[PDB]
Amino acid sequence: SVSKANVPKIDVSPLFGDDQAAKMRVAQQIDAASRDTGFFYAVNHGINVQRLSQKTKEFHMSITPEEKWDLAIRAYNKEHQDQVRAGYYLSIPGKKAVESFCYLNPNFTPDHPRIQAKTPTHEVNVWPDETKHPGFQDFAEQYYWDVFGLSSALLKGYALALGKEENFFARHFKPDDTLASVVLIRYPYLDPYPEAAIKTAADGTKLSFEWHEDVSLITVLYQSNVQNLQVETAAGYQDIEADDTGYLINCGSYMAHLTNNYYKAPIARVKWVNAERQSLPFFVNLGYDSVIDPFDPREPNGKSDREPLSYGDYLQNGLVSLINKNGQT
Ligand SMILES: CC(C)[C@@H](NC(=O)[C@H](CS)NC(=O)CCC[C@H](N)C(=O)O)C(=O)O
Ligand SMILES: [Fe+3]
């Protein structure tokens, strides 16, 4: 028998305002949730989520094989050596069900010095033909900045929760240099569903994606209304109920590092479900040279002996390790 995770629904709208005590009352709830299962739903968040699923499904349904190859990351097309992160992630019929499209900071252009320097984890986005996908690039770039705004406010909530000034995290989260990414993920309905795309967990649960900590500061996720996620607790894996108006929020391993494990990075997995569904994570990554000084809010003097980690190298390491562990998505 599988239990259900405590995932509180937190009205985050005060984090956009100027009522500081109201922000503290949000921060308290973020602290509580981060110390419990590690997940909460952000509600009253102001993002129009009503068509995100439709647009994601329709883009994947309508993009042709030729277009997928043309946009494909290096793992699927050796001609695209510069596309490590951004671009199309093809399914493999009979073997791999999921397909997805990842894009980065729209401000990463050939003019950007990190592109000029060929710094790892920085790439220029690739986009399909506008006339074949009218409005898609516009929608996607706008969505990036919409979720950027929400994420900056959430980061104020996390900073207050930890006893810091509200810009402790968000001052490192900037449009000119953020390594944050959006992934537009389609999980298809398949009949018959290929068993090779299903992994069996140690506890016997059929899965589409194995256990992992997120590589992020925090993760800001919209999913369509099909229950799939589970979070690991000491009592075992627990189901995360879907909420296809709220945003599912949790800390990544960078936050676990800098708080000296006071806010752990929850371990989650994706159960296999034979259902058309859409999943849109926004990974809140900082700049390549962003460094946050660790602290230990469990200690009277607040001091941590842990090394400040440069975020870019953390991201570099984290993305490769997740591929090595859980497979190329
Ligand atoms: C909701 C999650 C479980 C989602 N999975 C995911 O997004 C998984 C696990 S967090 N994430 C990744 O593979 C990292 C993608 C990083 C991205 N290509 C980039 O370069 O920045 C899913 O639906 O599979
Ligand atoms: Fe994850």
CA distances from 89 to 67, 147, 166 (A): 12, 22, 37
Ligand 1: residue of 76, 209, 215 to mutate (most ligand atoms within 8 A of CB) is 209
**Crossing angle for the helix pair 52-62 and 136-161, nearest 10 degrees?**
140
C-alpha of residue 212 to centroid of ligand 1, in Å: 10
3-state secondary structure the chain: CCEECCCCEEECHHHHCCCHHHHHHHHHHHHHHHHCCCEEEEECCCCCCCCHHHHHHHHHHHCCHHHHHHHECCCCCCCCCCCCCCEEECCECCCECCEEEEECCCCCCCCCHHHHCCCCCCCCCCCCCCCCCCCHHHHHHHHHHHHHHHHHHHHHHHHHHCCCCCCCCHHHCCCCCCCCEEEEEEECCCCCCCHHHCEECCCCCEEEEEEECCCCCEEEEEECCCCCEEEEECCEEEECCCCCCCEEEEECHHHHHHCCCCCCCCCEEEECCCCCEEEEEEEECCCCCCEECCCCCCCCCCCCCCCCEEHHHHHHHHHHHHHHHHCCC
Distance of CA 301 to the CA centre of its chain: 33
Residue reference for tokens 């005060």: 14
* Residue 212: how many other CB atoms lie within 10 Å: 17
Ligand 1 proximity of 329 Cβ (cutoff 6 Å): yes
Three-point CA angle 163, 167, 172, nearest 5°: 120
Cα distances (Å, whole numbers) of residue 58 to 108, 247, 281, 321: 26, 21, 17, 31
With beta carbons less than 8 A apart as the criterion, state whether 274 and 258 touch: no
Experimental method: X-ray
What are the chain's domains? 3-326 (2.60.120.330)
Deposited resolution, Å: 1.7
For residue 184, the CA-to-ligand 2 centroid distance in Å is 14
Give the number of the atom of ligand 1 that is nearest the alpha carbon of residue 209.
24
Structural tokens at position 100: 């997805």
Pocket test for ligand 1, best of 57, 74, 183 (most atoms within 8 A of CB): 183
